[PDB]
From Swiss-Prot, chain A:
Residues 1-227 are cytoplasmic. This is Butyrophilin subfamily 3 member A1. It comes from Homo sapiens. N-glycosylated. Homodimer. The chain holds residues 287 to 513 of 513 of the full protein. Belongs to the immunoglobulin superfamily. BTN/MOG family. Plays a role in T-cell activation and in the adaptive immune response. Regulates the proliferation of activated T-cells. Regulates the release of cytokines and IFNG by activated T-cells. Mediates the response of T-cells toward infected and transformed cells that are characterized by high levels of phosphorylated metabolites, such as isopentenyl pyrophosphate. It comes from the Eukaryota. It is found in: Cell membrane. Residues 36-227 form the B30.2/SPRY domain. Detected on T-cells, natural killer cells, dendritic cells and macrophages (at protein level). Ubiquitous. Highly expressed in heart, pancreas and lung, Moderately expressed in placenta, liver and muscle.
From Swiss-Prot, chain C:
It is found in: Membrane. Residues 3-253 are cytoplasmic. Belongs to the immunoglobulin superfamily. BTN/MOG family. Highly expressed in brain, bone marrow, small intestine, muscle, spleen and pancreas. Moderate expression was seen in lung, liver and kidney. The gene is BTN2A1. The lineage of its organism: Eukaryota, Metazoa, Chordata, Craniata, Vertebrata. Residues 43-239 form the B30.2/SPRY domain. This is Butyrophilin subfamily 2 member A1. GO terms for molecular function: signaling receptor binding. It comes from Homo sapiens (Human). It comes from the Eukaryota. GO terms for cellular component: external side of plasma membrane; plasma membrane. Keywords: Coiled coil, Disulfide bond, Glycoprotein, Immunoglobulin domain, Membrane, Signal, Transmembrane, Transmembrane helix.
Amino acid sequence: EQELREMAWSTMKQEQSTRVKLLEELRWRSIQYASRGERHSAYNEWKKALFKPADVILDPKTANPILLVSEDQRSVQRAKEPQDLPDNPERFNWHYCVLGCESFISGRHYWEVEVGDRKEWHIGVCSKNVQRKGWVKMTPENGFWTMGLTDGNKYRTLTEPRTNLKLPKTPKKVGVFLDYETGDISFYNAVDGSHIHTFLDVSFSEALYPVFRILTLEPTALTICPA
Amino acid sequence: WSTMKQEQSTRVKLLEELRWRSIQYASRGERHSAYNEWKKALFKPADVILDPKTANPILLVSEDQRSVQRAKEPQDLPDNPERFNWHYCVLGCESFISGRHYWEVEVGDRKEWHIGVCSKNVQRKGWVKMTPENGFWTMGLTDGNKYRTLTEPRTNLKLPKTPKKVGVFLDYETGDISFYNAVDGSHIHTFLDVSFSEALYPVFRILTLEPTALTICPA
Amino acid sequence: WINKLQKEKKILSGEKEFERETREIALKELEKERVQKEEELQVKEKLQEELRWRRTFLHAVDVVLDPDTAHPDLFLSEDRRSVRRCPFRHLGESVPDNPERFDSQPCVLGRESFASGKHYWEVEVENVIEWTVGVCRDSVERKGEVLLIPQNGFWTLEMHKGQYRAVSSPDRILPLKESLCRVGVFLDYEAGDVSFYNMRDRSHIYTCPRSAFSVPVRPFFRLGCEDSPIFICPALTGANGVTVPEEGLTLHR
Amino acid sequence: WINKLQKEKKILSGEKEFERETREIALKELEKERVQKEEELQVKEKLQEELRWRRTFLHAVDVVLDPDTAHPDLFLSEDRRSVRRCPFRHLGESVPDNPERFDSQPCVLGRESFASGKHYWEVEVENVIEWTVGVCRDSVERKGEVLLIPQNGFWTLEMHKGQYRAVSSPDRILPLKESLCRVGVFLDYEAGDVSFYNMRDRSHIYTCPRSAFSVPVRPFFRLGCEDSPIFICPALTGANGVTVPEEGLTLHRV
Ligand SMILES: C[C@H](CO)CCOP(=O)(O)OP(=O)(O)O
């Protein structure tokens, strides 16, 4: 009796044909909804509804020796000299980046990171099969999708080559929103609800990790606040 | 039991998901460009043939059912529940009940017109206010150069340009109707959240006489 | 048996003829009913056509009031076509008031009720200090005091303390050059049109915001002065009711 | 013998039941048509009542004039409610030889034809010095000069040499103490009434003696040697064909 297997064989084709057309139609809805835009109450309206609040805890085991993960496991500080500690393949050795213990395999999630009055930071989403040893350019082709501040009042998106993001305001709290299926990583100003950058049509194959890197010595810690 | 249950729950959830996507997806920039990139793929064209039988006796319609123009004097033509007797209104032949359609009206350089959709059961005998409550979802230009939407109360609309062409898009399932500036692809107005009841009909009215009528572009 | 069956055939074959006559009396009634219905339909649409022809006409209405439905303070001419407000002529007199009479509003209602068509009536309000004229629904309040507004069913033009105003929202004072000699109230039922016209020149003065009545509408007048003649102009009566000498009736009063 | 005969009996019973079942449909149709005729009788009675409430009412006609019957010396405005004179304006010009043309006196006929009921209209003649206004039979002679009298089918009021005048019987001097600006013409077909009124105060001027018409009557206007145009006051149109705001419409002008 193949009818029991026939039902699965039928639902597999109907499910494969459903999501492709749904995603194409959704992208055309995106390009159409581009007009008639405002955000006065949007951020607190749908960031708590459509995006499944997710908490990110910092993982000391991947942090560089120069980075001091705070005792609360949520904040990261910049220290003076690299303290000695074992070199696991997870651990970075050149790039100053730290990740979270959990990877979001699929779905839609978000997390809020407050940068405060910092002068150098880079937060974003990295892959799992990234090159953690040596130096590798943090481009989308290398698995990094990151927003960053540089030399005081410069804003950049780490594509290749670096592109400048001219913005009117100065963010203090940035919400990162990841949609696996739609393939969209979005950075929003959590204080007011504006828009900074969204990565469109990202071919996702592996799991995704939060990534935070800090270069300059600063007395301000990068805090990840949960839901 | 699950057959109609799916068609209820999953489609309702998809509708609410798209409604919530409207807010967060318009929170981005207003990159209103390539008006032909979405107006042909998301929405399918509709060739609007006018119905030279539901029109007011005052209106002249060309043999090709493109132009409607207010004639000099009212005519005395046979009447029936199809014919509007007071409102200077003309309807297309076809009705829309599902899917999503659109049509372009070339208003030219006129001084007064109104376009939109109306319910199947509209009151064609006497005067009835043209509001969303009755079934007339319409908008257009009055007082020479004043743009307005026929709500309760009627609402003035601030436009940064002058729309020589207006594109009306209907999407029955979402239940939202939109008027766009087809000249440059900008967005003029949009009635949201509307829950339709029966089939919808194109409508046109002009309370004035001008050398240029209301031309209707093909599908 | 065989005998039972032959009698059965004899009786049951004896049922066809009754069915035949029932069929016949059904069909004949059907056909003459069809033709009679056709004749009725033909005359009905003849009447339809005649009415459609005779429904685009403006009718000069000869308004006659009802002295029962006026304030007891008011005074009405015996001809019932002109009214005023006398200084309490019923001081010491008892006037039983019917349920359909105003009590605190010094108004009077035209007894004729319109339900379609275009109508209009003129009013001569020379030398008055407070006059309001217009249209009211047949279902307006009577027991107490209300406001003359389009919501309550009162399309009115008012002259208050020397200022000419619309439906009596004090926020719409019109730019009117001079006083009104003769004011015409025009009414279009199938369009919600209540217009006030300057009859010195037949010039547009005001149009009330459109509001479907759905109930018969009647003329309505209110006065505030004391003994200030207001005159409802009667429709042109022609020379009916008076013998015309062959010389030709001239300058009739 | 029994077998085939009882086949026949069963067959006959076969159509007896269908004949029986064909009766209720016919009876139900007849009763439903009874209901339909009752409803149509009710609608017909309502129509008759409404048409009885009809033309006992005075009808204010919106007079539009007929260019085809206008004299070549006469000129019509764009709205067909204004007529003036201009000598030598259609001398040899392209004008058809319409048999319904006034080509003797400077006159023009209203487009409306009246057959019954009371109907009246108003004319602005303040700017002229020689005006004739009234009613005419539809069969008045047109080619040659005629006499504007009831004998020929004319009921008119006239201005001649600064003096008001009757049907042009010069024995009927009109002692009007004030100069006219607006004149009202009133017609009553049943009682043969042709009245003239002074529209400033709506007072009687002259009623022509009763004479049964029996012919569709029509308004008739005649403009003397005065280039000032004659205006026929349009009926009270109201706010028709205009957009009404929510704060009302004040002082409409067109
Ligand atoms: C003559 C026009 C077209 O029929 C009708 C005017 O109706 P209004 O209600 O006064 O116009 P609007 O609703 O647009 O304000």
